[PDB]
């Protein structure tokens, strides 16, 4: 006889739901190990007893017929463990709040369970009816915890129940709104799926329903959470109840594993193809990780942290084929035995909440404002799979999909890498200590951030072979601390570049034409591709300030150069001007350059210091240049107003430097020419040289103009002595073929030495200087009454005394006839 004896009892009835342990549609055929084998089916938490008063007029649709035999009905009173045909069933109501409530409500010893088969809860917060018929066996909003072969371990420690569960199954948690875009877990065998302690709800762990669950599930194996759709939408359902559609706990939630397979997928959000960010991102087979910590309220008061760990996780990531294919990180760096590894930290803050030293310390005030965040500290990973592109798939990717991703959580984020090692696959990655920065909306002003980047380097390795291997020489290299503040109303791109590259060697002309060069300005130039979703490409604007400091440049090659060295200090390029437009202002600021040359033209050059003799050095260049491409509207201004140009020679070194030049459109300079002290010394001075060629007269005016072109000194002698060719000495004033002379008073005063003392001079240089070749009406007067004290012979034996030419349309000369023209007729005087 199907003796029915059970119904609704007294028991404390929840304010959502209806305490009442019925018996429904079940033959209760009953018939200290005292077993009454019974038929506990159909038991329902129909609920709703808080809404509407019972909410009668709309019983909730969750509700359980059937649900589980639970025949065998082991043990009595007395750890009461009941082995069972029944699993659990699910309150579809809240789990959040209104379940977790009526389960610390009715708990208020150590019992022990051992169900079936895992039904299918489906809490959203007939689905329910669903996993009641589950307990009988045991596209969105199918969140479901269903173990198919529970092996759960109900601890129950009720000694404020300080409860536990161990399985050895785990669910497939399809968690979405009350595409496949949710997560898809599978984990399944007991260390394949290790489920532990799930829930507690109990106020002797935490004091929603104080649970303090730390579900630290410790797996060892493949677990694959095989897609997972987004991030967010897990913050949204744990901290709301949910808000998708079809489109005082602390959760301490740890994992580790050393293989646990998986995907990472960016949470690009509407409230908050596929996600823009990180296109086929997956870190396959790494470590478990993604171990997270929550809380049940919206606008955690305590910040989130959302940690990883890994030592050489092959995670195949923007997969074509990973741009990064491994941690590979053997960096031991402390006194112990240390090994670093990767990490991929977050750190979120609730919404509206409350360069060694600038780029650092302004990125971690940046750092400690949070609307998202993304870490790395990767030691020695550097790496790329076989199948990568630097140059091409990290652009195309990593930095499209970068900050286009949704960026807001409860836009001024911040990002950091760091490494100890790197390697720019596809050349000269030279990386050690470097790293990568962003910041969003500083201090909470659109367009206010800060871009920054350091390094320490060896400056030209060289590709396909062999590395250039340049820089034989506290500031770090390519300090690249740009600055941007730019305008959305504006919606102009602006960029402040304050590069440094500090004692560099920035050449990458390999071949006699610039082809490694070729190659890097291929690689390398690409300006900040931004085709993302709220950026319309911004029209591109560049001003430079760039600092080219101690960028020593000894290693130019050529067809044949001679181990050519030029020691420049600073190179500052503070372009002020805009760079990409017909005018650019470039105040070239040099602060005391030099130059030293090599042993001998054919390229192998060896001597006893490298760091030679000076060759032709200066004081200072301010060459502010405005190319119009002074408000002078001829096209390539050229207004190199130099300052001054020393030079120091011998006859052997201005000989061999003649040969090295050999082998090897207004242009108003107003530039000193030479404060040569030109072994030898003779000084000689040409001030306010203002060779302003093709100014004009008409064509390439190319006036000498020379204020003065005072011959210091020659011979033996380096005493200024007044030699000639204020004084408008425009010995050269050109058109289109004519010439001049300054009538200054005394002219030609040769007693000093041996006047022939230049001729060998000029000797040693066409020994130097093997080949040497050149061995309307002009008007080309001396136009000097000349104060005189071979003609150098009859000059040294007189030592007025001469006269002016005054060859008024002579045209004697003929650029090589102007000895010819010299000795037209005959002339002497005193």
Not at 150 to 176: A, D, I, N
Not at 228 to 250: K, S, Y
Not at 331 to 359: A, H, I
């Amino acid at each position: 006889d199907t003796v029915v004896r059970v119904e609704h009892s007294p028991g404390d009835g929840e304010r959502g739901v209806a305490v009442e342990v019925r018996v429904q549609r079940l033959e209760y055929c009953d018939e200290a190990f005292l077993h009454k084998l019974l038929q506990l089916a159909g038991v329902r938490l129909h609920y709703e007893e808080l809404p509407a008063q019972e909410e009668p007029p709309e019983p909730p649709l969750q509700i359980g017929s059937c649900s589980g035999y639970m025949e065998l009905m082991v043990k009595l009173k007395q750890k009461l463990e009941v082995a069972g045909q029944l699993g659990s069933l699910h309150l579809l109501l809240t789990p959040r709040q209104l379940q977790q409530l009526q389960e610390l409500l009715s708990a208020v010893d150590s019992l022990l369970k051992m169900t079936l088969g895992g039904v299918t809860l489906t809490l959203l917060q007939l689905a329910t009816h669903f996993f009641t018929e589950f307990d009988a066996t045991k596209p969105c909003s199918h969140v479901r915890l269903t173990g198919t072969a529970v092996q759960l371990s109900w601890e129950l420690r009720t000694g404020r129940r300080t409860t536990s569960m161990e399985v050895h199954f785990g669910q497939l948690e399809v968690l979405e709104c009350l595409e496949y875009t949710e997560i898809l877990t599978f984990p399944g065998t007991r260390p394949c799926a290790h489920l532990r302690h799930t829930q507690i709800l109990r106020r002797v762990p935490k004091s929603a329903c104080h649970c303090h669950s730390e579900l630290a599930l410790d797996l060892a194996n493949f677990q694959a959470d095989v897609e997972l759709g987004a991030l967010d939408r897990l913050a949204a359902l744990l901290r709301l109840a949910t808000v998708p559609a079809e489109p005082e706990q602390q959760t301490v939630f740890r994992l580790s594993a050393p293989r646990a397979t998986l995907r990472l997928r960016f949470p690009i959000a509407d409230l908050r193809g596929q996600a823009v960010r990180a296109e086929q991102l997956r870190l396959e087979l790494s470590e478990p990780q993604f171990r997270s910590e929550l809380s049940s309220g919206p606008g955690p008061p305590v910040p989130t942290h959302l940690e990883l760990t890994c030592s050489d996780l092959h995670g195949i990531y923007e997969d074509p084929v990973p741009c990064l294919r491994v941690s590979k990180a053997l960096d031991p760096k402390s006194t112990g035995r240390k090994y670093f590894l990767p990490q991929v930290v977050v750190t979120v803050n609730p919404q509206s909440s409350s360069d060694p030293e600038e780029m650092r310390t302004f990125q971690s005030r940046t750092l400690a404002l949070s609307r998202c965040s993304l870490e790395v500290i990767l030691p020695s990973v550097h790496i790329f799979l076989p199948s990568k592109e630097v140059y091409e798939s990290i652009y195309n990717r990593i930095n499209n999909d970068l900050l286009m991703w949704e960026p807001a959580d409860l836009s001024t984020f911040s990002t950091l890498v760091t490494v100890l090692k790197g390697r720019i696959t596809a050349l000269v990655l030279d990386m050690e200590h470097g790293t990568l920065f962003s910041v969003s909306q500083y201090c909470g002003q659109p367009g206010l951030g800060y871009f920054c980047l350091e390094a320490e380097k060896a400056t030209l390795y060289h590709r396909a072979q062999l590395a250039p291997t340049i820089y034989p020489s506290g500031p770090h290299m390519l300090s690249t601390a740009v600055r941007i503040h730019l305008d959305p109303h504006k919606n102009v791109k602006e960029f402040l570049v304050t590069l440094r590259l500090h004692k560099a060697t920035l050449r990458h002309y390999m071949a006699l034409p610039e082809q490694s060069w070729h190659s890097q300005l291929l690689e390398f130039l690409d300006v900040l591709d931004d085709p993302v979703l709220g950026y319309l490409p911004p029209t591109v604007i560049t001003i430079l300030h760039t600092h080219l400091f101690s960028c020593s440049v000894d290693y130019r090659p050529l067809y044949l150069p001679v181990r050519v060295l030029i020691t420049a200090e600073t190179f500052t390029l503070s372009s002020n001007i805009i760079m990409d437009t017909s005018t650019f202002l470039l105040r070239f600021i040099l602060d005391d350059s030099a130059l030293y040359l090599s042993d001998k033209c054919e390229v192998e050059t060896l001597d006893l210091r490298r760091d030679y003799v000076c060759v032709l050095d200066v004081d200072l260049l301010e060459l502010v240049i405005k190319t119009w491409k002074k408000l002078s509207q001829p096209l390539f201004e050229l207004r190199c107003s130099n300052n001054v140009v020393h030079v120091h020679s011998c006859a052997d070194s201005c000989a061999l430097l003649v040969n090295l030049l050999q082998y090897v459109s207004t242009r108003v300079v107003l530039r000193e020419v030479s404060l040569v002290w030109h072994h030898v010394l003779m000084e000689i001075q040409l001030s306010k040289v203002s060779f302003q060629h093709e100014v004009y007269r008409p064509l390439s005016r190319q006036v000498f103009i020379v204020q003065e072109l005072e011959v210091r000194d020659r011979l033996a002698s380096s005493q200024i002595n007044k030699f000639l060719y204020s004084n408008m000495l425009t010995i050269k004033a050109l058109h289109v073929c004519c010439l001049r002379v300054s009538l200054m008073p005394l002219r030609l005063n040769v007693d000093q030495d041996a006047l022939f003392f230049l001729k060998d001079f000029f000797t040693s240089l066409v020994a130097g200087i093997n080949p040497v070749v050149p061995g309307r009406e002009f008007r080309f007067t001396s136009e000097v009454p000349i104060w005189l004290d071979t003609f150098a012979g009859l000059l040294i034996g007189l030592a007025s005394e001469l006269k002016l030419k005054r060859l008024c349309c002579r045209h004697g000369l003929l650029g090589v006839d102007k000895v010819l023209g010299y000795a037209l007729n005959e002339w002497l005087q005193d």
